[PDB]
């Protein structure tokens, strides 16, 4: 008797429901993507600085900065953060940043609450928080639901760029890669030294967001990435 084995796997309501919602999301939302890169080198040194003071309690990650610039980017241009209500549109002034966490169980969407107000002593322990209670499955689904948008970084493994999933009624969400040194010609002649540009990919629905605007979200966004000090006053 021959081969041809395969596996019929019972599916979990997590996968099943996420699939039923993401499907109608696709059929409803003409997903398109926008991707760019920005040099975090000065921001990485800001990570070694802010962490050279803050090692005393907690550790910081770069993604938190990208999230911060994402919030304020919406504060200056609310047109970026919006929800599709069908007959009308939901434009959210309150900014709650969801995050895509990589766990063996599956995709998790911990929601950040008004991160734009939080400082350097808050958002870190908040992300580490949602990761804490998320890894144990203690976080309730409702705190994974209702988020205005989300953010996901799969680049930890080195993916140049890629396509992600959004969820309704979330207009736009960002997906980030791994910063890879690229050649920027310099006025310094011999030194060509390459700086790492962190891949930043954003999604939008043309029935809600339009290209020029969100593209602007990435324009002033990346402008914040150049000098994160732009967030202070």
Q: Which residues are annotated as a binding site?
A: 47, 61, 152-153, 177
Distance (Å, whole) CA 214 – CA 203: 9
Q: Minimum Å distance from CB 169 to a second copy?
A: 11
Phi first, then psi, for residue 197 (nearest 5°) are: -100, 115
User: Is the CB of 119 or the CB of 136 nearer to a second copy?
Assistant: 119
Q: In what helix (H) or strand (E) does residue 28 lie, and over which residues does it extend? A: helix 13-28
Residue 215 in contact with a second copy, rule: CB under 8 A: yes
- 200 touches a second copy by CB under 8 A: no
Q: Which of 44, 128, 131, 165 binds a second copy (CB under 8 A)?
A: 165
Alpha-carbon span 106 to 171, nearest angstrom: 22
Least CB distance to a second copy at residue 109 (A): 15
φ, ψ for residue 44, nearest 5 deg = -65, -45
Q: With CB under 8 A as the rule, give the number of residues binding a second copy.
A: 82
CB nearer to a second copy: give 1 or 88.
88
Residue list 125-164, contact with a second copy (CB under 8 A)? 154, 157-164
Catalytic residue, chosen from 86, 181, 193, 210, is 210
- Write the CB contacts of 40 (distance below 8 Å, at least 6 apart in sequence): 62, 65, 179, 196, 197, 198, 225
Least separation in angstroms between residue 41's CB and a second copy is 14
Indicate which residue of 86, 181, 193, 206 is catalytic: 206
Give yes or no for residue 185 binding a second copy (CB under 8 A).
yes
d(CA 151, CA 69): 12
210 carries an active-site annotation: yes
The owner of tokens 């144990």 is: 136
* Phi, then psi, of 89 in degrees rounded to 5: -115, 150
Q: Tell me if 55 contacts a second copy by CB under 8 A.
A: no
How far apart CA 155 and CA 130 sit, in angstroms, is 20
In angstroms, what is the minimal distance from the CB of 136 to a second copy?
21
- Is the distance from CB of 68 to CB of 50 less than 8 angstroms? no
Taking the alpha carbons of 33, 139, 131, 129 in that order, is the dihedral positive or negative? positive
Which parts of 71-130 interact with a second copy (CB under 8 A)?
72, 75-76, 82-83, 85, 88-94, 102, 115-124
Question: Which residue numbers belong to the known binding site for CoA?
Answer: 47, 61, 152-153, 177
Q: Closest approach of Cβ 78 to a second copy, in Å?
A: 8
Q: What is the largest CA-CA distance in the chain?
A: 75
Residue closer to a second copy by CB (options 92, 129) is: 92
Residues numbered 11 to 50 that lie near a second copy (CB under 8 A) are: 19, 22-23, 26-27, 30, 32-36, 46, 49-50
> Where in the sequence numbering do the catalytic residues fall?
206, 210
């Amino acid at each position: 008797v021959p081969t041809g084995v395969f596996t019929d796997i019972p599916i979990s309501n997590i996968r099943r429901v996420i699939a039923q919602r993401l499907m109608q999301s696709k059929q409803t939302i003409p997903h398109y993507y926008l991707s760019i890169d920005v040099n975090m080198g000065e921001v990485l040194l800001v990570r070694k600085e802010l962490n050279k003071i803050l090692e005393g309690r907690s550790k910081i990650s770069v993604n938190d900065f990208i999230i911060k610039a994402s919030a304020l980017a919406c504060l200056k241009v609310p047109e970026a953060n919006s929800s599709w209500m069908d007959t009308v549109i939901r434009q959210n002034h309150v900014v709650d940043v969801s995050v895509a966490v990589s766990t063996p169980a599956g995709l998790i969407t911990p929601i950040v609450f008004n991160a734009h107000i939080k400082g350097v002593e808050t958002i870190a322990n908040d992300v580490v928080s949602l990761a804490t209670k998320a890894r144990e499955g203690k976080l309730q689904p409702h705190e994974f639901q209702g988020g205005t948008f989300t953010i996901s970084n799969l680049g930890m493994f080195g993916i140049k760029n890629f396509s992600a999933i959004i969820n309704p009624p979330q207009a736009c969400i960002l997906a980030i890669g791994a910063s890879e040194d690229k050649l920027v010609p310099a006025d310094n002649e011999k030194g060509f030294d390459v700086a790492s540009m962190m891949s930043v990919t954003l999604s939008c629905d043309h029935r809600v967001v339009d290209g020029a605007v969100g593209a602007q979200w990435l324009a002033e966004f990346r402008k914040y990435l150049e000098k994160p000090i732009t967030m202070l006053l």
